Write a protein that binds this ligand. Structure first.
Ligand SMILES: COc1ccc(-c2c(C)nc3c(NCCNC(C)=O)cc(Cl)nn23)cc1S(=O)(=O)N1CCOCC1
Ligand SMILES: Nc1nc2c(ncn2[C@@H]2O[C@H](COP(=O)(O)OP(=O)(O)OP(O)(O)=S)[C@@H](O)[C@H]2O)c(=O)[nH]1
Lengths: 162, 465
């Protein structure tokens, strides 16, 4: 029925491709063959009684195809690697240079399963989260936790731009 | 999912974790295992501490960072753990300094205790005879006691504790060499937890001879201020001020693994790993075997042949005490033969083999092993009842059995050695194919009939002299 385009951006290693594989093929793997250039993937869900279809973009040098036609963008960091959270500031200057000024953003801490290796506290993140204009959640791509929730959340939030 | 599948299976143990950590170049796996370390029992992971810490120093930052968090956690809940980390970190680098300094950042009481012990040993260097050294040692140890009970402990001790007293008169120096090692006895009060417990209070002060261990406890106990307490136990350590113990530690792990392997399978070989404590690349401590003395000195005091001494101390060949002692001999011989072959242990003589009161032999000087450059003497064969003997045939049977057992667990052994070679300037890793040669020595390709022959060949070689 409807068509919602969403992009995934973030540092290398944070888990974008497995987020995509969990969410779109319900599959995960520890061994990893690198994504060469670009992917999208698609799956349809329903929000508020309406059949929607979501388009996710998986990211070398950033051509501006990314950030084109995105109603929403999931900006993801690895909770267990502090630097990835640190660069969320640089990922938003990018996103303001190359993307729609009225776009939906979710901050995502991935790899929440690595409890004992955690380098970024949920509070520090959520503080920054509501201090700014981003929605916030923590996911784990390895185990099927909150991956579905994450998408369905951002997708519900989106259709509300009637 | 097939990899993640394995890691979540029952098959996953601390061994496998280290193997993947060591080999895998995938940072997602490295980080994943770093986290999974926490789920394991403290005891199982502890055994591999030298490997882990070695990796941290000499491996990619990615690998270190996955290990560090677990280390810091352990360091924070146990200063003993902290101590052993700090000591190992320093010894294995001559990147390291930062984590070491952070851990030491507290341990001063212990570190001063250890410093003094080392300091003592170095002074005896000016005294050229064994007997002269001992008297200087005894006096200066008495000065330690002046240092109060100090909330310091022997990491070489099985448990957490506080040191209360040093029975200096019982301490003895073991040789006349330039940097001679020396044996001391230490009194301690056992803890339930070191980290939470008050250092005990001083209790005011109001002969050494060849004797069994428990008689020595008796003698020491009756004289000691603290002896009445039930909390009280006696420990012992050998102090080596100028000898590297990093190879010694490696052998220990190998001995410990091989011991478990033969234990896991049901092969009644016998061997005895003795605890090692690395303090520097220079210096270390050893937990000694009690109730044991060198074959060589056993032969100088007895004036007997090895067999004859056995007969004297236990009884004639028709007695149980003898047959038990003979049996303990035979099982310990097969064990150490196998250890000597696999690790290619050299410089084997009766100065390096101890005999305990129950009949086991014990090898001790694990210099000259592997790449760095065992004897069945008739004195040994006689105790076994001779070449045609049933007990001797049994000796050969165990070696094959113990070999078959070893093969079933080869990877656990090679792992210990193969990791340790990392960035190593130790003489035991001198070859191009140290680990490669080691694997060949397990003869994994051979059939059992082939191994029987190889065992036979081994024994024939051990006899030529
Ligand atoms: C690093 O090399 C050693 C390895 C093992 C040992 C040891 C161990 C684990 N247990 C004992 C031991 N047991 C008796 C304890 N007290 C009694 C009688 O009950 C007696 C001796 Cl002399 N040694 N030793 C010592 C040394 S060494 O002190 O550096 N030195 C090496 C050269 O050869 C002489 C010994
Ligand atoms: N413990 C844990 N490990 C994860 C998690 N997500 C990914 N890993 C691992 O992180 C590694 C990163 O690979 P990848 O899936 O390509 O992430 P990505 O770099 O963000 O994806 P890309 O946009 O660059 S193609 C994977 O090997 C994967 O096994 C997680 O949620 N928890």
């Amino acid at each position: 029925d409807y068509l919602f385009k969403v992009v995934l951006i973030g540092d290398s290693g944070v888990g974008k491709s497995n987020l995509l594989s969990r969410f779109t093929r319900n599959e995960f793997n520890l061994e990893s063959k690198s994504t060469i250039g670009v992917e999208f993937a698609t799956r349809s869900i329903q929000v508020d009684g309406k059949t929607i279809k979501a388009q996710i973009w998986d990211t070398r040098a950033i051509t501006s195809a990314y950030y084109r036609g995105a109603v929403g963008a999931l900006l993801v960091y690895d909770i267990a690697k502090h630097l990835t959270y640190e660069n969320v500031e640089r990922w938003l200057k990018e996103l303001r240079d190359h993307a729609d000024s009225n776009i939906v953003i979710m901050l995502v801490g991935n790899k929440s399963d690595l409890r004992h290796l955690r380098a970024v506290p949920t509070d520090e993140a959520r503080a920054f989260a509501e201090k700014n204009g981003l929605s916030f959640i923590e996911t784990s791509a390895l185990d099927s936790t909150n991956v579905e929730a994450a998408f369905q959340t951002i997708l519900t939030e989106i259709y509300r731009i009637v | 999912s097939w990899l993640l599948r394995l890691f979540e299976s029952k098959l996953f143990d601390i061994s496998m974790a280290i193997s993947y950590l060591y080999n895998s170049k995938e940072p997602g796996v490295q980080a994943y295992i770093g986290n999974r370390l926490f789920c394991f029992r403290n005891e199982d992971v502890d055994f591999y501490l030298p490997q882990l810490l070695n990796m941290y120093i000499h491996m990619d930052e990615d690998v270190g960072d996955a290990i560090k968090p677990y280390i810091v956690h352990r360091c924070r809940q146990s200063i003993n753990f902290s101590l052993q980390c700090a000591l190992l970190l320093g010894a294995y680098s001559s990147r390291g300094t930062k984590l070491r300094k952070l851990i030491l950042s507290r341990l001063a009481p212990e570190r001063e205790f250890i410093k003094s012990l080392m300091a003592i040993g170095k002074r005896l260097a000016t005294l050229p005879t064994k007997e002269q050294k001992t008297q200087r040692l005894i006096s200066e140890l008495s000065l330690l006691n002046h240092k109060l009970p100090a909330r310091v402990w022997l990491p070489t001790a099985g448990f957490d504790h506080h040191v209360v007293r040093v029975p200096h008169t019982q301490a003895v120096v073991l040789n006349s060499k330039d940097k001679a090692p020396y044996l001391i006895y230490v009194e301690v009060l056992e803890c339930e937890n070191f980290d939470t417990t008050s250092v005990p209070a001083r209790i005011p002060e109001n002969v050494a001879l060849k004797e069994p261990w428990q008689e020595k406890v008796r003698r020491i106990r009756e004289g000691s201020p603290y002896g009445h307490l039930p909390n009280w136990r006696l420990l012992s350590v050998i102090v080596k001020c100028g000898d590297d113990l990093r190879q010694e530690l490696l052998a220990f792990q190998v001995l410990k693994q091989l011991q478990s392997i033969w234990e896991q399978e049901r092969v009644p070989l016998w061997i005895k790993p003795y605890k090692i404590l690395v303090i520097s690349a220079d210096s270390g401590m050893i937990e000694p075997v009690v109730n044991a003395v060198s074959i060589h000195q056993v032969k100088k005091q007895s004036q007997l042949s090895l067999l004859d001494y056995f007969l004297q101390e236990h009884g004639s060949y028709t007695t149980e005490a003898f047959l038990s002692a003979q049996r303990n001999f035979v099982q310990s011989c097969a064990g150490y033969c196998l250890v000597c072959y696999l690790l290619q242990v050299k410089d084997r003589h009766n100065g390096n083999i101890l005999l305990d009161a129950e009949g086991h032999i014990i090898h001790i000087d694990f210099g000259f092993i592997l790449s760095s450059s065992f004897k069945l003497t008739t004195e040994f064969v006689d105790v076994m009842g001779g070449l045609d003997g049933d007990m001797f045939n049994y000796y050969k049977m165990l070696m094959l059995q113990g070999l078959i057992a070893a093969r079933k667990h080869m990877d656990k052994v090679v792992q210990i050695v193969e990791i340790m070679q990392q960035g190593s300037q130790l003489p035991c890793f001198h070859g191009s194919s140290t680990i490669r040669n080691l694997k060949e020595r397990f003869h994994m390709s051979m059939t059992e009939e082939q191994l029987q022959l190889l065992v036979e060949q081994m024994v024939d070689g051990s006899m030529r002299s």
